[PDB]
Swiss-Prot record:
It is found in: Nucleus; Cytoplasm. The chain holds residues 650 to 1051 of 1084 of the full protein. It is linked to HDAC4 point mutations and chromosomal microdeletions encompassing this gene have been found in patients with brachydactyly and intellectual disability syndrome. However, HDAC4 haploinsufficiency is not fully penetrant and multiple genes may contribute to manifestation of the full phenotypic spectrum. This is Histone deacetylase 4. Ubiquitous. It comes from Homo sapiens (Human). Phosphorylation at other residues by CaMK2D is required for the interaction with 14-3-3. Keywords: Chromatin regulator, Coiled coil, Cytoplasm, Disease variant, Epilepsy, Hydrolase, Intellectual disability, Isopeptide bond, Metal-binding, Nucleus, Phosphoprotein, Repressor, Transcription, Transcription regulation, Ubl conjugation, Zinc. Responsible for the deacetylation of lysine residues on the N-terminal part of the core histones (H2A, H2B, H3 and H4). Histone deacetylation gives a tag for epigenetic repression and plays an important role in transcriptional regulation, cell cycle progression and developmental events. Histone deacetylases act via the formation of large multiprotein complexes. Involved in muscle maturation via its interaction with the myocyte enhancer factors such as MEF2A, MEF2C and MEF2D. Involved in the MTA1-mediated epigenetic regulation of ESR1 expression in breast cancer. Belongs to the histone deacetylase family. HD type 2 subfamily. Homodimer. Homodimerization via its N-terminal domain. Interacts with MEF2A. Interacts with MEF2C and MEF2D. Interacts with AHRR. Interacts with NR2C1. Interacts with HDAC7. Interacts with a 14-3-3 chaperone proteins in a phosphorylation dependent manner. Interacts with 14-3-3 protein YWHAB. Interacts with BTBD14B. Interacts with KDM5B. Interacts with MYOCD. Interacts with MORC2. Interacts (via PxLPxI/L motif) with ANKRA2 (via ankyrin repeats). Interacts with CUL7 (as part of the 3M complex); negatively regulated by ANKRA2. Interacts with EP300 in the presence of TFAP2C. Zn(2+) binds at residues 18, 20, 91. The nuclear export sequence mediates the shuttling between the nucleus and the cytoplasm. The PxLPxI/L motif mediates interaction with ankyrin repeats of ANKRA2. Residues 6-391 are annotated as: Histone deacetylase. GO terms for biological process: B cell activation; B cell differentiation; cardiac muscle hypertrophy in response to stress; chromatin remodeling; epigenetic regulation of gene expression; inflammatory response; negative regulation of gene expression, epigenetic; negative regulation of glycolytic process.
Length: 391
């Protein structure tokens, strides 16, 4: 059926395409979606390069021309330049040579394609051509600032897509949720003074001591945007690590009450999976299950009438990102999800997480009615919170 979940992917984002895939992140996720038959139930959407004008909704002209255009256009030596871009591999295939100067050039070109791929999917959902969508896209975008690439990001795909929704379709309210384990500093910057888009980040913060070092609970916006930047910053380190119970409690007490009050017209998700188990201690440190992300997706699908697009950001462990991508797409298709273990449903969130949640709720009680009514119940398990709503 055509009114269903869309997927966007493009082999031109790959360093090396290879049958029987070795094989990087997005090629592996695409295979898992193909192999499980989820792609078959989905509408596959054709991507394209973002235009230079589209990238300039977020980034400076200078940034866009430097990283967004083929350097050879400014310049026997052509045949020699083309030759060393490529290398023949032990599978008998060819790829972009990762040991050369073309590694970062190609990644920036991949980034330009990633933005257009996301824009295409977002517009089909926002317009009702599609219901839902997931963008299988690389590199990530959420750390790229107006004039600064960083943390493997060149262009902020999700922020560009939001700017174009506002400028082309006049979308009144957009919610961006960012659940990559790292703060989306780029996205925060792009909308910091704008009350028409609510940015909500869940991230490891530990009082400024985790990459990229931004995203304090204090940072609530500037000007008329005051109140519309929510940093659900976890602090306390890994004593113990954050897991399913902690993120589920954060959705119950902070994310869903604020997002529900805001009442967005479209939801965009910066969907990194580096919080799932399999991402050791400097990269991630947390141990969410892949299946928890299927549940978080289903929660957000209750907003904006279900007009939601998830865009892959970080995540490295192949099993983890494939398990998680599978759970999110399955949720978007409306399939029944694997139930969360009794263990997770019974578990009270750890003390560091409760403290973190209460700090944010305190700061944002000033700006949201849903946090003015009551006392905190952040320390309850899901079963307990369920039990103690009734009577
Ligand atoms: O998830 C991501 N992008 O999607 C990340 C971007 C940047 C990340 C990050 O934490 N970095 C800090 C660690 N690091 C390193 C390290 C270099 C030596 C030892 C440990 C880490 C190189 N580059 C980085 C970027 S994760
Ligand atoms: K985040
Ligand atoms: K904002
Ligand atoms: Zn190969
Ligand atoms: Zn990340």
């Amino acid at each position: 059926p055509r009114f269903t979940t869309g997927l966007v992917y493009d082999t031109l984002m790959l360093k090396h395409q290879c049958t029987c895939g070795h094989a990087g992140r997005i090629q592996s996720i695409w295979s898992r979606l193909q192999e499980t038959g989820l792609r078959g139930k989905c509408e596959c959407i054709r991507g394209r390069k973002a235009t230079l004008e589209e990238l300039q909704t977020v980034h400076s002209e200078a940034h866009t021309l430097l990283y967004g255009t083929n350097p050879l256009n400014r310049q026997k030596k052509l045949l020699g330049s083309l030759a060393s871009v490529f290398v023949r591999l032990p599978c008998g295939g060819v790829g972009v040579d990762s040991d050369t100067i073309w590694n970062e050039v190609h990644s920036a070109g991949a980034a330009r394609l990633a933005v257009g791929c996301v824009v295409e999917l977002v517009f089909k959902v926002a317009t009702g051509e599609l219901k839902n969508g997931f963008a299988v896209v690389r590199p990530p975008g959420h750390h790229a600032e107006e004039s600064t690439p960083m943390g493997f990001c060149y262009f902020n795909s999700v922020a560009v897509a939001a700017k174009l929704l506002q400028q082309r379709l006049s979308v009144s309210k957009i919610l961006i949720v960012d659940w990559d384990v790292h703060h989306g500093n780029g996205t925060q910057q792009a909308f910091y003074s704008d009350p028409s888009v609510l940015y909500m980040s869940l991230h490891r913060y530990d009082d400024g001591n985790f990459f990229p070092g931004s995203g304090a609970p204090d940072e609530v916006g500037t000007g008329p945007g005051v109140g519309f930047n929510v940093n659900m910053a976890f602090t306390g380190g890994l004593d113990p690590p954050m897991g399913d119970a902690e993120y589920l409690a954060a959705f119950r007490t902070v994310v869903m009450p604020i997002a529900s009050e805001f009442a967005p017209d479209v939801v965009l998700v910066s969907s990194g999976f580096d919080a799932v188990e399999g991402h050791p201690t400097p990269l991630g440190g947390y141990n969410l299950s892949a299946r928890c992300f299927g549940y978080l997706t289903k929660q957000l699908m209750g907003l904006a009438g279900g007009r939601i697009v998830l865009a892959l950001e970080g995540g490295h462990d192949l099993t983890a990102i494939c398990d998680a991508s599978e759970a999110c797409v399955s949720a978007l298709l409306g399939n029944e999800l694997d139930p969360l273990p009794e263990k997770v449903l019974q578990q009270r969130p750890n003390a560091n997480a409760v403290r973190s949640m209460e700090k944010v709720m305190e700061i944002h009680s000033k700006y949201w009615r849903c946090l003015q009514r009551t006392t905190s119940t952040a320390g309850r398990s899901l079963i307990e919170a369920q039990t103690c709503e009734n009577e």
